[PDB]
Structure formats: C-alpha cells, structure tokens
Amino acid sequence: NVTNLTTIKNQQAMLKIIQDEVNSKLEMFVSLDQLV
Amino acid sequence: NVTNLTTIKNQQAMLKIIQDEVNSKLEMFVSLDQLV
Ligand code: NA
Numbered sequence: 121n122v123t124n125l126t127t128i129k130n131q132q133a134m135l136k137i138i139q140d141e142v143n144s145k146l147e148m149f150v151s152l153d154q155l156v
Numbered sequence: 157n158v159t160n161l162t163t164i165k166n167q168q169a170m171l172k173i174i175q176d177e178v179n180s181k182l183e184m185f186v187s188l189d190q191l192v
Contacts, residue, residue, distance in 0.1 A: 128160055132166065150181075152188075153188050
C-alpha cells in the first residue's frame with residue numbers, strides 16, 4: 121500500500137514535467153497556422 | 157491511505173487540464189489540414 125502512494129508521487133512529478141514539455145513545440149505550430 | 161486518494165485527485169485534475177489543451181491544439185491542426 122505504501123508503494124502505490126509513492127508511485128503516484130513520482131508519477132505526479134514526471135507527469136508534471138512532461139506536461140510542461142509539449143507546449144513549447146505547440147506554439148510554433150500555432151505560428152505556422154497563423155502564417156498559412 | 158487517504159492522502160493517496162488526494163494525490164490521485166490532483167493527478168486527475170492535472171491530466172484533465174492537459175487533456176484539454178491538447179484537444180484544443182489538435183482541433184486547429186485539423187482545421188489547417190482541411191484548409192490545405
Ligand atoms: Na501539429
């Protein structure tokens with residue numbers, strides 16, 4: 121039972137970092153859409 | 157054990173936000189593809 125709570129933590133941190141990574145690429149796709 | 161649930165609720169909220177943002181971007185991608 122301890123482990124799941126710990127996993128949820130580590131997974132929380134790793135989810136947060138990856139969810140921050142996607143946006144930077146996205147904005148350029150936004151700029152390309154504006155250009156087109 | 158209750159904390160694990162609270163952290164899991166935080167997981168669900170965070171993903172939710174991310175789940176949205178990505179859908180909002182994919183819609184504009186679809187619009188671009190149809191236009192091209
Ligand atoms: Na794209």
